């Protein structure tokens, strides 16, 4: 039925057309924040945090981490059916979860913090990471198969003081799991030549803006560096969690990222939380050390504020942006599908677009003009060998919504 995007699927329309050939279907029906979606091998992992009252200043009511199957719901439309749910005892201590599928389970790596979000209280946070393993098909009377909690004791960080999962989902290679992650490096140990800051033709930029933008504020104690957290399951005895820093090609501040397999190769997306507002994604050259051949995309960006609005390419000192990933659905033409926010300085107007590096092939809005939106997570797969995509979109009971979009074969309705 539902399988991974691998092999050689049905044709997708490769021409650019204004025709309405994308038909999004809503498959989902007090605030709900911090969402997480992952789709792998016909299964899915989902997570959220339900708060009471406000979304930012509200009390944490319940943290949900579940897994299940992606099935044909009946009318040839894929949907998600929960099969195994888990809730921590204190919802306000679990942060920054990231789910990676392997064979029988989803392994979700989360951070444990009694000082709030480690991104906003980095220096105070004492690094504590947990692993919750959830079976995609639970079995009765089966011990720790269905749900298993593992407090991670051994972590190798290299030059970084602290490391944390930072992204919705990672990949598996053989028996080794890789989670999107970030490392906190003190600015005193941050060796960066300002010569590498691309200030050319930028009238009001300074070569210092890159290094200062590598932190949440210009005087931050840490800089954030994206990368991977590696967990080798073959080393069964006690598995060390190893940090792998991302290469410094087109370096931007550590931000929520995603590594996913598509057409049998790894692809990486990194959210643009700084001055480089054009979308950052591409095929992975090497996983260890992590280097990504970023696409030179000139059509997809993200909303910002005053300093770094959408389409900005000059280095400024800013920490602003949103996570809006994209899934590669055709490597031979490097075509991708994802939801972007169609606004320069406000997080709003979600639009699902199928696009190449230098052109948007075809798109469709997901809500009215004034509708506010935030993080979006898009994962694509095959249903009876037609490419489908499921997108989680935060939208303003403030709660996320899930859409299923089939990628059409022809360019006319």
């Amino acid at each position: 039925g539902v399988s991974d995007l691998v092999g050689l699927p049905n044709q997708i329309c490769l021409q650019k057309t204004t025709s309405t050939i994308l038909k999004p279907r809503l498959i989902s029906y007090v605030c709900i924040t911090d969402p997480l979606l992952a789709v792998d091998n016909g299964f899915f992992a989902y997570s959220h945090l339900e708060k009471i009252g406000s979304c930012t200043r509200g009390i944490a009511k319940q943290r949900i981490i579940g897994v299940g199957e992606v099935l044909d719901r009946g009318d040839k439309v894929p949907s998600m059916f929960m099969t195994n749910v888990w809730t921590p005892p204190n919802p306000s201590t679990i942060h920054h979860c990231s789910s990676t599928y392997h064979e029988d389970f989803y392994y979700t790596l989360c951070a444990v913090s009694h000082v709030g979000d480690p991104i906003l209280n980095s220096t105070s946070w004492t690094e504590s990471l947990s692993l919750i393993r959830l079976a995609v098909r639970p079995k009765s009377d089966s011990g720790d198969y269905n749900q298993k909690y593992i407090a991670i004791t051994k972590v190798e960080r290299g030059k970084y003081d602290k490391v944390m999962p930072y992204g919705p989902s990672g990949i598996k290679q053989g028996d080794t799991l890789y989670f999107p992650a970030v490392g906190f490096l003190p600015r005193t140990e941050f060796q960066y030549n300002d010569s590498n800051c691309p200030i050319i033709h930028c009238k009001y930029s300074k070569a210092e803006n890159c290094r200062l933008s590598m932190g949440v504020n210009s005087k931050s104690h840490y800089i954030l560096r994206s990368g991977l957290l590696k967990y080798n399951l073959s080393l069964g005895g006690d598995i060390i969690l190893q940090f792998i820093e991302i290469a410094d090609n087109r370096l931007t501040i550590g931000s929520p990222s995603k590594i996913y397999n598509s057409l049998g190769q790894p692809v990486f997306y990194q959210a643009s939380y700084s001055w480089d507002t054009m979308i950052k994604l591409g095929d992975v050259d090497t996983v260890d050390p992590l280097r990504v051949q970023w696409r030179n995309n000139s059509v997809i960006s993200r909303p910002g504020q005053s300093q770094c609005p959408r389409f900005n390419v000059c280095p400024e000192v800013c920490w602003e942006g949103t996570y809006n990933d994209a899934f590669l659905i055709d490597r031979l033409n490097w075509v991708s599908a994802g939801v972007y926010l169609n606004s320069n300085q406000t997080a709003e107007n979600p639009v699902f677009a199928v696009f190449k590096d230098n052109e948007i092939l075809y798109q469709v809005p997901l809500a009215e003009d004034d509708t506010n939106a935030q993080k979006t997570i898009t994962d694509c797969f095959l249903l009876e060998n037609v490419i489908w995509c499921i997108s989680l979109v935060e939208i303003y009971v403030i709660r996320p919504k899930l859409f299923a979009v089939k990628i059409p074969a022809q360019c006319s309705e």
Epitope: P198, H201, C202, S205, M278, N296, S298, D357
Partner: antibody, heavy 121, light 113 residues
Framework: QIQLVQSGPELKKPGETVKISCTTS????????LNWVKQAPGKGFKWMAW????????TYADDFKGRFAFSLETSASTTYLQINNLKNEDMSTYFC??????????????WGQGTSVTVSS | DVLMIQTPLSLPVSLGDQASISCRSS???????????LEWYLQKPGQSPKLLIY???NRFSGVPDRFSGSGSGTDFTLKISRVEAEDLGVYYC?????????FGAGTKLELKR
């Protein structure tokens, strides 16, 4: 009335230092940056650097790090290219050209007349 | 490194003919801002170069309409419809999309006899 004028020809021995000037007139100096380009005799052009006349910060190619220095004086509306520890591979004709910021046209529309630098013992 | 390959290095043409110079890049010259900073310059003997064409196809001030530019991504062409004697010289393509900015080897437009 837009014109860029460079310093005269230079004849130097290996190891010495040369400083080529490029004085511009006829436009607002800070509204367009400058490009330094190098042409070897009977050969092609090599882009050396681009200087931001508003901030003073240059962006140079990797081959021209170290003994090359790209500075400017805003009062005189001049940019300077200084080469230290001259070697034979520096003998060439050096041009300055007007290259705009992203706010307009970054193409090299107005050029200097060029400055020849001969290096020999 | 981004490489600019010009064809041909020497282009003998009779006066009043059409000339075509091809420039191909090792990587796409479409910057991530949508612009393709491919420029064509001309240099006459004993003269500083002169900007002919900017952004693939736009003509700089004072350039005759007989000069035109076309292409996209990695393939570009400069075209002279009817070559007057004032066009004899050396034509260079140039890319300003990736640092370090690079030139072509050049094409010598000379007179056939």
């Amino acid at each position: 009335q837009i014109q860029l004028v460079q310093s005269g020809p230079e004849l130097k021995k290996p190891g010495e230092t040369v400083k080529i000037s490029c004085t511009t007139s006829g436009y607002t100096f800070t509204n367009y940056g400058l490009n330094w380009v190098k042409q070897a005799p009977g050969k092609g052009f090599k882009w050396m650097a681009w200087i931001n006349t508003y901030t003073g910060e240059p962006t140079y190619a990797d081959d021209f790090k170290g003994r090359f220095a790209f500075s400017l004086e805003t009062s005189a509306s001049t940019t300077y290219l200084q080469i230290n520890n001259l070697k034979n591979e520096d003998m060439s004709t050096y041009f300055c050209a007007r290259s705009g910021y992203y706010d307009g046209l970054k193409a090299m529309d107005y050029w200097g007349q060029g400055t020849s630098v001969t290096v020999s013992s | 490194d981004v490489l600019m390959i010009q064809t041909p290095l020497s282009l003998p043409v009779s006066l009043g003919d059409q000339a075509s110079i091809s420039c191909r890049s090792s990587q796409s010259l479409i910057h991530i801002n949508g612009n393709t900073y491919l420029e064509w310059y001309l240099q006459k003997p004993g003269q500083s170069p002169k900007l002919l064409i900017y952004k693939v196809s736009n003509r700089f001030s004072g350039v005759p309409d007989r000069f035109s530019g076309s292409g996209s991504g990695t393939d570009f062409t400069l075209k002279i419809s009817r070559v007057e004697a004032e066009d004899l010289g050396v034509y260079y393509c140039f890319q300003g999309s990736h640092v370090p900015f690079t030139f072509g080897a050049g094409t010598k437009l000379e007179l056939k006899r």
